[PDB]
C-alpha cells in the first residue's frame, strides 16, 4: 500500500457534505489538516495552486519507476555501461530530502543543523565511527551548494535511488577502481561530482526533451490520482474567493493533465453540467519559473490557447475572461486579483521553491501538500509503541540503554524504508520536518482535506513560549 | 534599575560553591541557564568567548549615552545642525532588534516572518490602519538589505534612538520640508537612506577613530561590569577543558579591558595569587573579523604583545605559550586546539554574527548572552498577570474582546519601554526571539550562570513533535 | 562574383611549387599574406586551426541564404507573422561587424571609438542631423553589452539582414504601431530588444537543433569551398612543425566536413596515396568552447570516434596517435605539444573569440582569415580612383568641398554594398579594421596564401614611431 | 636636469603673443603639441582639467623623494625593520608604467601585448634566458589584476623604487630566507604579494591620513611648478568656450594649490587686476572619484566653501556662480555646461583613469600631459644617433649583428635611466606608449603648449591605412 493507494482510495469516496459527517471525518488523522501557525480561513480571499504533485498527484511507485527507467535509458544512450539496464526501481530505498554529497558519493539524511542522521555509500549504510573518517564532526555545511545537493522534490525520488545504484555498480564492477572522490577506468576518471551532474542532466532531459510527459499522458489512469471531490472543493473556494493556478508547467501539458482531472460526466456535484477546468480559475498562469517568480520573475506573456504557443510580445492588457498567462511574477497575480499577500493561501508540494519562498519573499499564507504523509501516518499510528518505547528510554537515561536506544531507533526507522521516515530518524527530526514546521502554515497529505472544514474555520496552533517565559 | 544594575548586583556577591547552595541558586530565574536544545556539558572540551558584551558587559544606560553623545558630536562636526546637541539619550525608547526602513524613515519591530508588530516614525507610533498606506501587507521583506537595516547589537542601541531623534527633529523643524522619502532643505535633499548612512558611518567612526575607547578606558568602573566570579568560572572551565578568546577587538583594547576584568588582589579564589588574564586562555585571537572568521577568514598573524603591533608576515608556527594571534579563521582554532565543532561551546552576545554563524557554518555549540534579560525577567515575573490575562483573552476569543486584547497588549509592552520587550509584542514573538530559539542552544543574562551548574550537567529541552505526531 | 567565387576560382588551380612561380604569385594582392606585425616563420613550431570559415569556407551567398531561410522558418514556427516567408536574403545589404542597437532598433556601423559612421532603421539610412535625436554625440558606448550587440561573425550575416527586414516589416505593417523602443500590437508590446532576442535564439536553434548542419552535409559542393592545395599546405606545415585543430564544432560534424575537404583521389600531391584527414593533425580537439578555452576552459574529455559520443569521465592519459579530445583548454594544447605561446601560429576567422583572445590571454601568434577580403580587394583596386579623389579632397580642405567629400564617400561605399566596406566608410576606419590591425599579426582572404611563402620567410612590418619620435 | 626643471625653466618665460613669435616657438619639439588623431580646435566648446600633475605639476625628484620618505616612515611605524630608514630615493631607477609581479617579486617593463622587455628582481636585471624560468613565454597576462599591478601614475614612482629597495633588502639580509614567492623570517612568511599590499596601503595612508599634503602646502615653491602663463591660457580658453575643473582632490587641498598657482600680482596678463582662481572656471567639481565618475559616479553634493565641508544632502539646484560641486558624474558636467562629449577637450595626466575612460565611456576629446616628456625629448634628440644606428641594424638584419643590436639597445635605454624610456626599450614600444597613441588625441609635456596655437588651429594626423590598402 503506497501513499498514492491511500490517496486514490480516499479519492474514490463521494463527498458527504452533511455538517456532522464532515466534523466526524476530519477527526481522523488521514483526512485532517495539520496546523503549524493559526490561520483564520475567513481572511483568505484567494486560493492559489501549483499543479504537479498538488492538483495532479502522480501514482507511486509507477511514476517514479517510469522516471527512473527513462533516466537510465538516457544515461545508457550517452555512453554509460549497458549494466545500468538491469537496475530496477525500488521504492523501499529512497526517502525524500536526502543530501547527495558530491565529494564522497554518499547519500545523507540530516537534521536542521546539518548533523548526520544516516549515511549510505551505494547500498552500504555507514555506522557512526566509520562516518567520522569523512565527516569528523558528523556535520555538513548544507549552504555549500557546489558540494551538497538536497533532493527535496518528489521528482528527485528516482535519481535518489539511481545515485545509490550507480555508486554500488561502479564500486563492485572490476573494470573500475574505487577512489576517495570517484572511479578510475584506465585513463578516464569519473568523479562522483561529474557522475551526479550526468544524472541531474539526464533527469532534466527526460522531463524537458524526452518521453516522460508523452508516456504519462498516454496513460493518465495509471499515472495520475483522480478525484471527483476536486471540482467540488474548487467550486466551494470560488464561492468565497478567487482561485488561481501558477505552475511551472507549460500550457499544453497543463491542459492535458487538468482536462483529465476534471473529466467526469458532471460538474462540481453529481447531476450538474460538466464545466471546462479553466472555468474554475479566475487566473491561470503557466511557465511561472518559480522560485524566481517570487522576486523579479520574467516578462508577462499571453498564451494563444488554440496553438499552445505564446503570442509575440509582452502582455500589457487587463485580466479578462479566457486569458491564459505565461511567466510574470507573484506581483502580477496580486495586482490582477487585488490581493495582499496575507489574503492568499498558496497550496503546493515544493517546500523550498514555492512554500518557503512565497512565505519569506511575499508573506503569503501556505498549505503544504505532503503526499507521503498519507502512508507515513499509517506507519506512525501502527508502530506508535516503538516511538513510545524510544521516548521512555530517552527519559529513563535522562551503558546498554544506549545500545537499546540505537536498536529501537533502527527498528522504528526500517518501518518507513531503508532511509527511514521523511520527518525523523528515531527522536531526531530531519531538515525536511523543520522546514515544514517553519514555513508551512498548514499541511496535509492532500489539500482535498480542506473540504472537510467549514467555510470560515479557525485553524489553531498553541502560542510559542521561550524557555525563560515557561 | 537597568539590566546592568541587576548584573553588577549579582557580580558583587562572592561564590558560595557548596553544592546545595548552587542547586538552590540556579532555581531562581535570574541565575538560570535557559535551554533551547539539550546539551551534555560532559561532551564540551573547549570553551570559547567573545569579549564585548560577553566578558566585558558595558554598563547601561551610561555606555549607550556615551556612544550617543560622541555620535552626535561627530555628525555636528561634519555639518549636521547645532540642534542635535540638545538631544539626550533616553534608554526608555530603544529596544534591540528593530529594523530601520531607509525608504520611509521608520523603525519597525517585526516577527520572524516580517509581519509588522510596531511602527514608529520619529516618536509618532503609527497605528494599524495608517501603517497600511506604506506597508499594504503589514509586511517587509527583511532580506532586502539595501532597504532594511536590522539594529541587532547592543552597540546599535544609541543609533536606534538617534535615528528616531533625527526623523523627529527634521520633521518638526520649519527649515525642512517633509517628503515621503526624506527632507528638502531648499536645493538639498536628504533622503532617509543618506541620513541613515551618515549615522551608521558616524557610529563606526566613533568606535574606530574617535574617542569612545579612550573614554571607556579612562573610567572602567563607570562603564564596565566587574565580577570576582569571572576568574573563578574560567579557572573551572580550564580544569575540564581548553579556553579560548576570539574577539573582533584589537590587542591593545583587549588587554586594557581584560586587565581590568581580572584586577582583584587574588586569583580565581580569594587567598590565591593573582594571575595575568592571558594565563586563563589556551589560545587568544584578536582582530577576528567575525562573521567572515567562520568561513575563509583572513591570514593568521602574530601580535607582538610588547608594542601591540602585528609582526610582519603570516604566522606558520605552532600554538605556544604566550603567543597571541590576529585574524585567522574558526578552523585555526579547531586545528590548534584539536577540537571538532561539537566539542566547542562558544559564548557570545552577537545572535547573528557569532552565534548563528558558528552554529550554521561549523556546528559549534552556542551560549548566547542576552544582557537585557537580567531586567526583562524582572518585568516578566512582576507583570505576569497582564500576560496571563492576554492568554485568557486569546483563549476566550478562540467585538470589544479585540479592543481589550489591543489595550492589554499595549499596557504589557509599555512595561518594557516604548518599543516593548526584546522578545515579543503581546502574544507575538519578535524576529529576535525566534533567532535566539533557533540558534542559541543555551542562553542567559550572563554566562556566569554556568558557575551554578555542576561540571557535567545535562541541560535538557523536551523533544519537538510535529503537529501530526502529537 | 562573390568572395567565395574568388576563393573557389583560386582553389581550382593546382599548386606550381617552382620557387619563382611562388615568388611571382604572392606579389598579387589576392594571393598575399598581409602583415600587421613582423613574424619570423622559422620560430613557428606549431600551426593551429579553427574549422568553420577557416578550413571549411562556406560559399556565399548560398550558405547565408540557407541560414536566413531556416531562421525565418523557425520564427514563423514560434508565432511570428506569415509575411516573414516573403523575405528573401539579399547579400547586397549586410556588411559584417555592424552593431544592433536593441533600444532603438538600428544597425550601426562604428569606428574604433564608437563614433557613428552609418545608421539604418530597417532599410532607411538615417542622415547626420536625424541621427543626433537618438545619438546626441554621434557615439555609442560599445561596452554596454546589454544594449549593443556586435554582429562580428560570418554566421551573423543572415541575422544582420533579418533584423533590418523585421524592423522594416513591422514599421510598414498597419497592424502594428511604431514606438520609440518597439512595436505595439494591441495589448502586446514587442520591444526591439525582445525581437532581437528571438532572432538570436532562432539562429542558435537553427545551428544546434535545426536542420542547418544536415542540409549543409547533404550538399557539400553547393555549400563548402574545396581546394586540393589544402592537403599540400598542411603536409608542408607538418614537415616543419606540429599541426592541430581546435574547433567549437562537435566530432560528427567535424568528421563530415573534414572528410569532404580531403576527398580527392590523392594525398598531398597528385599521384600520392590518399590519407585520412586525421593523419594531418598531431592533435585534434572538438567542442573547444572558445573563448573560455583560452582561460579556465572545461574538463578534458575523450571522443569515442566510432560512436561520435564522449567517453564517460575526464581524460587523464597522454597524447597518443588516433586520440580525439573534447573540451579542455589552450594550456592542454601547449602542454601536450610542448609549445610556448609564441611558438604557435593560430589560424582562424573569429577576430574576437579566437584571434583577440589567443593573443591577449596567451600570447599566441595570429593569422586572421577574412573571406570577404577576396572580393573587397577587387573593389579596392578597381575603384582606387574614388579613394584617391577622397584623399585629395581631405588634403585640399586641410563649403562645397564638404558636400563633395560626402558624395564621394557615398559612391565609394556603395561599391561594397549598402553598408559599405568591412574596413571603412570613406576615410574613416571601422572598429573591425582597428581590431584586425591590433590583434591579427598576419591576415589574408585565405590561409592557403601561406603556401606561396618559403618555409622560413620573415614577414615584415615597419617599426611604429610615436608622433614626438617622428 | 629633471623634467620639472625643463618645465619650470619654460614657465619662467613671459608669453610673447605676437603671432609670428608663437609660430616659431611651437616648431620646437619642447613647446609642441603632438597629434595622434586630428582635432579641429574650433569644435571644442569646453575645456576640462584635472589638477594633480596637470595644473599642479609636482617638482622632481623632490616630490617623489618626499612621498618615498613618508611611505618608508609609515612602514617602519607599523613594524618593518629599521634598516628601511637608510634607503634614499633614487630618481635614476624608476620609469613610470612598470608592472609589479606580486607572485615572484619582479618589476617588469612590458609591451602592449604583455611581452617582457625588462625584468628586475630588486636591483638585479635579469637577462633573457634566466627570465624564461619564471616567464616561459616571456609574457604576462596583464588582465590578471590579482597578480600584476601596473604602476601607471606619477604618484606610483616612489613605490616603484621602494618595491625594488625592499626586495633587495630582504634578499640580502641574513635574517630572512629568500623563497620563490617571498621571504621566511622563522615562523613568519612574508609573500611578495603581502609586502606589495603593505606598500600600497602605506602610500594610500601617506596621501589620505599622513603628512604629505601638509608638507607640500608648507613649501609650495619647493614642490609645485608655477607659471604666469597659466592664467593667460585659461583666460583665452574662457573667451572661446567654457572651462571646468574635475579633480579627485578635496576642496581644501584644491583651494590651497590653486591659490598658489594663481598667486601673482596680476591677473591673466601683467598690468591686469588679480582675479581669484575660481573665476577662471564655469564649473568646479572636487571629490570626483574618477574613473567611476565616467559611469554611474556618486551623488552630486555641494561644498560649503567657507568651512570646506560638504552640505548635508544631494544637490538638486542649477549651475550658479560661486557654487562648488563634489562627486557627481561626467553627465552632470555635460548637462550643466550644455555640452556633448566631442565638444569637450579633457586635459589630464592619468592615461588610464581619466584619458582612457573619458574617451571610451563618453567620447570626450583628450589631451594627455606627460611631464617626463619634457626631458625624454632632450634625450631622444641628443642621442638620436643611437636610435638611428639601431634602426640601421634592424634594417641590415632584415650572428654578431644581434649582439650589437642588444648592446646598442642597452646603451640607448641607459640614457633614460635603469628602467629606460617611458615609451620604449630599443625598437620595442611599451604598453604605455601604445596607450598614449590609442587614447590621447593630443599630448605634450605640458598643456601650456596650447598657448602657442591659434584659437581654431586644426591639429592634423595622417589617415591610417591597413596593410592591404597600402
Ligand atoms: Mg509541484
Ligand atoms: Mg561582542
Ligand atoms: Mg570559425
Ligand atoms: Mg592627476
Query: What separation, in Å, do the N-terminal and C-terminal C-alpha atoms of chain C show?
Result: 43
* E strand or H helix that includes residue C443: strand C442-444
**Cα distance between residue B34 and residue B368, in whole Å:** 10
Name which of C380, C387, C443, C371 is nearest C416 in CA terms: C380
**Up-side HSE of residue D318: CA atoms within 13 Å toward CB?**
3
Tell me the three cell numbers of residue D218: 608648507
Q: Which three cell numbers stand for residue A208?
A: 524537458
Do D32 and C468 lie within an 8 Å CB cutoff? Answer: yes
How far is the C-alpha of A148 from the C-alpha of A101, rounded, in Å?
A: 5
Which of B359, B463, B467 comes nearest A113 by C-beta?
B359
Instruction: Point out which residues pair with B109 in neighbouring strands.
Output: B118
Helix (H/G/I), strand (E/B), else coil: B245:
strand
Mutation for A interface: C178, C250, C304, C313, most A CBs within 10 A: C313
Residues of chain B with Cβ-Cβ distance to D314 below 8 Å are 188-191, 194
Question: Which 3 state secondary structure label does DSSP give B35?
Answer: strand
Contact C264, C275 (CB under 8 A): no
- Contact in structure between A93 and A163 (CB atoms under 8 Å): no
Residue B462 neighbours by CB distance under 10 Å: 9
Resolution (A): 1.8
**Chain C environment of D427 (Cβ under 8 Å):** 463
- In angstroms, the separation between the Cα of residue A284 and the nearest Cα of chain C is 18
Distance of alpha carbon D233 from alpha carbon D369, whole angstroms: 15
What is the full DSSP assignment across B110-153?
E-TTSBEEEEEETTEEPPHHHHHHH-TTSB--TT-TTTEEEE-S
Which residues are near ligand 3, the ion (C-beta closer than 5 Å)?
C 50, 52-53, 349
Q: Would you give the distance in Å from CA B132 to the centre of its chain?
A: 31
Beta-sheet pairing, C458-459 with B344-348: unpaired
Name the neighbours of C, counting chains with at least 3 Cβ pairs within 8 A.
A, D
Residues B371 and C312: their CA atoms lie apart, in Å, by 59
Q: How far apart are CA D282 and CA D244, in angstroms?
A: 6
Give the sheet arrangement for strand A124-125, strand by strand. Answer: A124-125, A116-121, A106-110, A98-101, A148-151
**At what angle are helices A62-77 and A192-208 packed, to 10 degrees?**
110
Please name the residue ranges forming H helices in D140-228.
157-172, 192-208, 212-217, 220-223
Q: Which residue of A has its CA nearest to B338?
A: A136
CA distance D318 to chain B (A): 9
The count of other CB atoms within 10 Å of the CB of residue C462 is 9
My answer on whether omega of the bond before C223 falls inside 30° of 0, hence cis, is no
Which residue of A421, A422, A469, A470 is the best one to mutate when testing the B interface, meaning the one whose CB has the most B CBs within 10 A? A469
Of the residues C5, C12, C18, C52, only one is catalytic, namely: C52
Radius of gyration from C-alpha coordinates of chain A: 23
The answer to whether A441 is a known catalytic residue is no
Distance CA C21, CA C3 (A): 24
Helix H or strand E encompassing B201 = helix B192-208
Q: Is residue C45 within 8 Å of C241, Cβ to Cβ?
A: yes
Do residue D342 and residue C138 have CB atoms under 8 angstroms apart?
A: yes
- 3-state helix/strand/coil string of A339-366: CCHHHEEEEECCHHHHHHHHHHHHCCEE
In total, chain B counts a number of residues equal to 470
The shortest C-alpha distance from D281 to chain B (Å) reads 22
Task: With beta carbons less than 8 A apart as the criterion, state whether A377 and B468 touch.
Answer: yes
Residue B455, C-alpha cell as written in the block = 561540571
Residue C58: strand, helix, or coil = strand
b/e code A215-253 from CB counts within 10 Å (16+ = b): bbeeebeebbbbbbbbbbbbbbbbeebbbbbbbbbbbbb
Contact check, Cβ <8 Å, C463/D427: yes
Experimental method: X-ray
- Breaks in chain B (C to N over 2.5 Å), named by the residue before each, are 398
Nearest-angstrom CA–CA distance, B61 and A340: 41
Burial of A72 (0-12, 13-18, 19+ CB in 10 A): buried
Give, as one character, the DSSP assignment of residue D456.
T
Contact B366, B440 (CB under 8 A): yes
- Sequence-ordered alpha helix ranges (H) in A125-175: 128-134, 157-172
Q: What is the DSSP secondary structure assignment for residue D80, as one 8-state letter?
A: -
**For residues D287 and A429, what is the distance between their CA atoms, to the nearest angstrom?**
57
Cell readout for C243 is 599541426
| Chain CA centroid to CA B350, Å | 5
The β-bridge partners of C349 are none
Using DSSP's 3-state secondary structure scheme, residue D145 falls into coil
Helices C373-382, C3-11: inter-axial angle, 10-degree rounding: 110
The minimal CB distance from D363 to the residues C34, C137, C467 is found for C137
D463–C394 C-beta distance less than 8 A: yes
User: Residue D82: which residues within 8 A CB-CB, separation 6 or more?
Assistant: D76
Residue D331 annotated in ligand binding: no
| Residue whose grid cell is 527512473 | A68
Q: Which position has the grid cell 531507533?
A: A409
Identify the H or E element spanning D118. Answer: strand D116-121
How many residue pairs from chains A and B have C-beta atoms closer than 8 A? Answer: 98
Q: Which of A78, A185, A315 sits opposite C313 (nearest CB)?
A: A185
Of B330, B324, B344, nearest to B291 by C-alpha is B330
Contacts of C154-158 spanning 24+ positions with Cβ under 8 A: C154/C53, C154/C58, C154/C64, C154/C96, C154/C349, C154/C371, C155/C52, C155/C67, C155/C203, C155/C207, C156/C96, C156/C203, C157/C64, C157/C67, C157/C94, C157/C96, C158/C64, C158/C65, C158/C67, C158/C68, C158/C71, C158/C89, C158/C94, C158/C203
Cα dist. D388→B97, B163, D29, D422 in Å? 76, 72, 18, 18
Angle between helices B384-397 and B400-414 (to 10 degrees): 160
Cell numbers found for residue B447: 554566562
- What lies within 8 Å, CB to CB, of A292 at 6+ separation is A298
For A250, A285, A288, A325, A378, the CA distances from A329, given in Å and listed in that order, are 16, 10, 7, 11, 39
B50 noted as active-site residue:
yes
- Which other chains touch chain B, taking contact as 3+ CB pairs less than 8 Å apart? A, D
- Phi and psi for B257 in degrees, rounded to 5? -70, -50
DSSP symbols for C343-379: GEEEEES-IIIIIIHHHHHH--EEEEE-TTHHHHHHH
* Residues 6 or more apart in contact with residue D214 via CB below 8 angstroms: none
The number of C-alpha atoms within 13 Å of A85 and in the hemisphere containing its C-beta is: 6
CA–CA distance, C300 with C315 (Å, rounded to integer): 6
Count the residues in chain C: 470
Q: How far apart are CA C293 and CA C296, in angstroms?
A: 6
> Torsion over CA of D150, D155, D157 and D159, rounded to 10 degrees?
-80
Taking CA–CA distances from C434, the nearest residue in chain D reads D466
In chain B, the domains with their CATH numbers are: 37-57+224-370+442-448 (3.40.50.1000), 62-217 (no CATH)
DSSP H helical ranges for A249-399? 251-261, 330-337, 357-362, 373-382, 384-397
| H or E segment to which residue D178 belongs | strand D177-179
The C-alpha cell of C82 is what? 506569415
| φ and ψ at residue B274, rounded to 5 degrees | -60, 140
Q: Are A301 and A311 in contact, with CB atoms under 8 Å apart? A: yes
Handedness of CA B250, B252, B253, B255 (dihedral sign): positive
Nearest ligand to the C-alpha atom of residue C254: 3
Contact C385, D431 (CB under 8 A): no
Buried b (16+ CB within 10 A) or exposed e, D166-194: bbbbbbeeeebeeeeebbebeebbbbbbb
User: Pairing relation of β-strands C283-286 and C242-246?
Assistant: parallel
C403 Cβ partners below 8 Å, 6+ apart? none
Taking the C-alpha atoms of residue C355 and residue C348, their distance in angstroms, rounded to an integer, is 7
The DSSP 8-state label assigned to residue D96 in this structure reads: T
Closest listed residue to residue C111, CA positions, set C140, C151, C143: C140
Cα–Cα distance for residue pair C164/C124, rounded to 1 Å: 9
Beta bridge partners of C125: C120
Judge whether D27 is annotated as a binding position: no
Q: Which residues contact A465 (CB under 8 A, 6 or more apart)?
A: none
Q: A98, A159 in Cβ contact below 8 A?
A: no
CA of A52 to the centre of ligand 1 (A): 4
* Radius of gyration over every alpha carbon of chain C, rounded to an integer in angstroms: 23
Q: Under DSSP, is residue A93 helix (H, G, I), strand (E, B) or coil?
A: coil
With beta carbons less than 8 A apart as the criterion, state whether B68 and B162 touch.
yes
Q: Which residues contact D406 (CB under 8 A, 6 or more apart)?
A: none
Report strand pairing: A424-425 vs A428-429.
Answer: antiparallel
**Among B118, B40, B129, CA closest to B454:** B40
Query: Is residue C229 within 8 Å of residue C11, measured between CB atoms?
Result: yes
Tally Cβ neighbours within 10 Å of residue A403.
Answer: 9
Q: 3-class SS at A294?
A: helix
Residues 6+ apart with CB under 8 A from C91: C2, C60, C61, C64, C65, C417
Amino acid at each position: 500500500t503506497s501513499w498514492s493507494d491511500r490517496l486514490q482510495n480516499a479519492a474514490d469516496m463521494p463527498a458527504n457534505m452533511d455538517k456532522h459527517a464532515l466534523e466526524k471525518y476530519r477527526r481522523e488523522a488521514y483526512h485532517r489538516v495539520f496546523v503549524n501557525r493559526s490561520l483564520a480561513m475567513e481572511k483568505i480571499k484567494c486560493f492559489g495552486f501549483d499543479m504537479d504533485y498538488t492538483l495532479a498527484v502522480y501514482k507511486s511507485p509507477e511514476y517514479e519507476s517510469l522516471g527512473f527507467e527513462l533516466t537510465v535509458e538516457r544515461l545508457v544512450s550517452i555512453g554509460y555501461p549497458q549494466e545500468l539496464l538491469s537496475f530496477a526501481y525500488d521504492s523501499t530505498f529512497p526517502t525524500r530530502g536526502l543530501v547527495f554529497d558530491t565529494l564522497y558519493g554518499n547519500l545523507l539524511k540530516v537534521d536542521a543543523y546539518g548533523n548526520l542522521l544516516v549515511c549510505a555509500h551505494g547500498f552500504n549504510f555507514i555506522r557512526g565511527p566509520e562516518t567520522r573518517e569523512q565527516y569528523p564532526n558528523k556535520f555538513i555545511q548544507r549552504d555549500d551548494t557546489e558540494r551538497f545537493y538536497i533532493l527535496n522534490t518528489l521528482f528527485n525520488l528516482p535519481e535518489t535511488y539511481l545515485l545509490a545504484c550507480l555508486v554500488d555498480f561502479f564500486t563492485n564492477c572490476p573494470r573500475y577502481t574505487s577512489c576517495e572522490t570517484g572511479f578510475k577506468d584506465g585513463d578516464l576518471f569519473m568523479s562522483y561530482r561529474s557522475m551526479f551532474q550526468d544524472v541531474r542532466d539526464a533527469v532534466d532531459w527526460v522531463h524537458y526533451k524526452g518521453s516522460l510527459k508523452e508516456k504519462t499522458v498516454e496513460n493518465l489512469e495509471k499515472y495520475v490520482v483522480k478525484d471527483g471531490k476536486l471540482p467540488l472543493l474548487l467550486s466551494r473556494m470560488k464561492e468565497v474567493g478567487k482561485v488561481f493556478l501558477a505552475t511551472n508547467s507549460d500550457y499544453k501539458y497543463t491542459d492535458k493533465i487538468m482536462t483529465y482531472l476534471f473529466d467526469f460526466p458532471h460538474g462540481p456535484k453529481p447531476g450538474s453540467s460538466h464545466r471546462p477546468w479553466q472555468s474554475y480559475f479566475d487566473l491561470i498562469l503557466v511557465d511561472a519559473r518559480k522560485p524566481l517568480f517570487f522576486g523579479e520573475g520574467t516578462v508577462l506573456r499571453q498564451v494563444d490557447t488554440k496553438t499552445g504557443k505564446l503570442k509575440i510580445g509582452t502582455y500589457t492588457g487587463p485580466l479578462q475572461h479566457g486569458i491564459v498567462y505565461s511567466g510574470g511574477s507573484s506581483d502580477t497575480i496580486c495586482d490582477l486579483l487585488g490581493a495582499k499577500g496575507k489574503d492568499i493561501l498558496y497550496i503546493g508540494d515544493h517546500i523550498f521553491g514555492d512554500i518557503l519562498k512565497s512565505k519569506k519573499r511575499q508573506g503569503w499564507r501556505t498549505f503544504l501538500v505532503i503526499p507521503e504523509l498519507a502512508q507515513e501516518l499509517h506507519v506512525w499510528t501502527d508502530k506508535s509503541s516503538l516511538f513510545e518505547e524510544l521516548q521512555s528510554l530517552d527519559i529513563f537515561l535522562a551503558s546498554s540503554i544506549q545500545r537499546r536506544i540505537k536498536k529501537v531507533t533502527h527498528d522504528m526507522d526500517m518501518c518507513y524504508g531503508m532511509m527511514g521516515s521523511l520527518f525523523r530518524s528515531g527522536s531526531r527530526q530531519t531538515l525536511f520536518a523543520s522546514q515544514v514546521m517553519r514555513y508551512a502554515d498548514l499541511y496535509a497529505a492532500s489539500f482535498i482535506n480542506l473540504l472537510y472544514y467549514p467555510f470560515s474555520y479557525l485553524f489553531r496552533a498553541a502560542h510559542v513560549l521561550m524557555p525563560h517565559e515557561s
